[PDB]
Design a protein around this ligand. Structure first.
Ligand code: NI
Ligand code: NI
Lengths: 427, 427
């Protein structure tokens, strides 16, 4: 009364999706490859990777062919000098998302109404070590003036803002594997609360190098399986660590009345956002998944949605022994008998683990799932331990229509025990 | 109606402040040194800095004496192996903030009610280049397993969570110079909206090395003035770039009813949070300060506070030609004739520019200002160009009491054109 005010929360919808991933570039193409059970995980070739026990990764395919990434479609040869690889991928995904929403702010009022929330999980390590080398060897003057702008996490968000004249909230998170989920969630709360009417929201990461793969490997996080068709297998008995990918994924979120008055196409509504912390270990998850259960519960509370109204969960499950099990337990614990009436899939068998981009690419897939009422498969799931007895949509996509509202969750958990869930619903 | 729901916003207050800064460690001590017109900016000594045109910086004083930072008061010699310098400073500031609030969550319910929002502006570059060196020279096995946990931006937030069992929202931003402001603002919105009843919120950065100073210098951002008593002079005619500092600052924000029911001491209330983007240049600010004017206006709108109710502005002003002028113009433009009835100061002459920590240390100072009704000075302001004609509280602190509510703003602007304002009020 004296303690608790009311203020307007607007409803928020997704009107644009832009994807630069190991499955390819372009939204309907990546969706088709995903649903079709395709994967971007390949073998590492290069004598530079000989020292590391990992031998697979998921690269964004590059070139001018179908579904490939051509940097020069989006950025000039000069711009490329001042930008990191993740920033270039973010600029590409952003342009594609805005084209997909039809949103091209030209008036001062629309420019001010649109912000950017694009996070990055890790800065590019090779920019740092190559500058350190130049500085140690040739001195102060061989350090680039674009060194700082190239290594700051917020520079993708900053470059997308300048390129498209987006003057609303300018925000960047860096929460490891949860980055992309927080970016969409934070953008959801900003629009809801009134800070903005449109947000260009997502994640980017492109850090596959021997040094980064050496680091994740020494942390015991990466699969040592040398067969790229088999390495990443969420919920599988033989899962043995994640497979690193790269990419960017960007969603245009928009205030609902704003979307309707301009006659935009709406994929889905964002209903809720949940966050929690394990407060356990810096790399390993709560083995009982208590923090997972809390962020999912929080998102349901924020949405005003009961467990029994959920149709689909896009799992974080990265193909790790402890992680996949923890998450499985969380779902069973929260959803109880409804755990077996819903479907769960993890799309990381297709994309790899895209780090700062994982949570946004998975929010985009969950958004497509709700819009189409069709679920992408979990790859490689060709057997199961007795406790892994949910419907994991193994291997083949499945239609999942209702006359009820199709409501989904997407989970993202990260090093440091940082957890987020998004609740996203079809109209 | 169909578009616009209402939901509960709780009021949010600050109950704890923890400071690890170039002025010293400890809240009332740092406040006394600040008000007293002291500075932490010193000369760079070291042959390793010979190559760089900058010759001053602000270090956290280290040792077991009064106001000094002794790492081993907070972390063990083993922990120090798995943590970066900024993470250790964040752990110190966090412990001090929670001691200052009297908040020590022991029950599962209070642990779940308390989250951490601690950002970092730049990862420590020397961790990256030293590992790159070890990897290139001795191979995969000489890479530390703590390499990844040591270089991720969210690891300070993660370590503070694990150390104190904080299980609420776990969130880390990385928005350059705006980091600490966003962290407090995001933590404010989380508590208001219901995601948490307590947040351990702030920023940390500790990246002074030749390489980082080389980078900021090549970007033309740093003062080349060799006199440490004079280098950093916000709003001064001879200002010529910022002076890099290091440190951490952490605030405990708390739901208002929660603070009152446990009989905690409340410093101030957080009323509003504003965010914007210049959409201009990647390092230089809008020269007319339009983005500054928009984030300040947004914070006032969020607060429900008219320009004429503001008593104090803690300026971002870092001692740069374009920046200080832009911000000056913004204030004059928003506040009009009331610009001359309020007071403005920049405390960066004392602390240096603390990067990821600047916005949180400046929110703490603004919070102290409101609680005491006493304003810290702008250092070195011994002359003025004709357009710099506000009350900058030059050189000496000033009492600034009212029977009206003391309302302040604190501004933070950053590379990438990312802007934030906080509105904070005495009770
Ligand atoms: Ni709100
Ligand atoms: Ni709210």
């Amino acid at each position: 009364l004296y303690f608790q005010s009311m203020r307007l929360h607007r409803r928020v919808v997704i009107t644009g999706i832009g994807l630069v991933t190991p499955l390819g570039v372009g939204t309907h193409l990546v969706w088709d490859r995903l649903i079709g059970g395709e994967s971007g995980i390949v073998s590492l070739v290069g004598e530079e990777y000989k020292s590391i026990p990992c031998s697979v990764a998921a690269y964004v395919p590059r070139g001018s062919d179908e579904g490939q990434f051509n940097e020069q479609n989006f950025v000039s040869k000069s711009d490329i000098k001042s930008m990191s690889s993740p920033t270039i991928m973010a600029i590409g995904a952003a342009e594609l998302a805005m084209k997909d929403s039809g949103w091209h702010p030209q008036s001062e009022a629309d420019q001010v109404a649109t912000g950017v929330a694009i996070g990055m999980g890790m800065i590019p390590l090779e920019v740092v070590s190559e500058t350190a080398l130049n500085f140690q060897t040739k001195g102060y003057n061989k350090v680039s003036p674009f060194f700082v702008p190239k290594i700051l996490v917020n520079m993708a968000a900053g470059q997308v803002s300048i390129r498209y004249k987006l003057k609303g909230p300018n925000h960047a998170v860096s929460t490891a594997c949860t980055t992309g989920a927080h970016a969409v969630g934070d953008s959801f709360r900003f629009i809801a609360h009134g800070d903005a009417d449109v947000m260009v929201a997502g994640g980017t990461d492109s850090c596959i190098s021997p040094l980064s793969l050496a680091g994740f490997s020494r942390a015991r996080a990466l699969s040592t399986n040398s067969d790229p068709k088999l390495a990443c297998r969420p919920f599988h008995p033989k899962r043995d660590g994640f497979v690193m990918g790269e990419g960017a994924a960007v969603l245009v979120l928009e205030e609902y009345e704003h979307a309707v008055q301009r006659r935009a196409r709406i994929y889905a509504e964002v209903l809720g956002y949940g966050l929690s912390g394990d407060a356990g270990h810096i790399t390993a998850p709560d083995p009982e998944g208590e923090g997972a259960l809390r962020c999912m519960a929080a998102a349901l509370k924020d949405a005003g949605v009961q467990p029994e109204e959920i149709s689909y969960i896009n799992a974080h499950a990265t193909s790790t022994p402890l992680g996949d099990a923890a998450e499985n337990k969380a779902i069973k614990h929260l959803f109880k008998d409804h755990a077996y009436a819903l479907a769960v899939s993890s799309t990381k068998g297709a994309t790899g683990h895209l780090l700062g981009a994982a949570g946004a690419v998975e929010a985009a897939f969950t958004t497509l799932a709700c819009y189409y009422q069709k679920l992408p498969p979990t790859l490689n799931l060709d057997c199961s331990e007795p406790e892994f007895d949910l419907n994991y949509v193994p291997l083949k996509a499945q239609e999942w229509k209702t006359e009820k509202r199709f409501i989904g969750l997407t989970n993202s958990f990260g090093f440091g025990g940082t957890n987020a869930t998004l609740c996203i619903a079809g109209l």
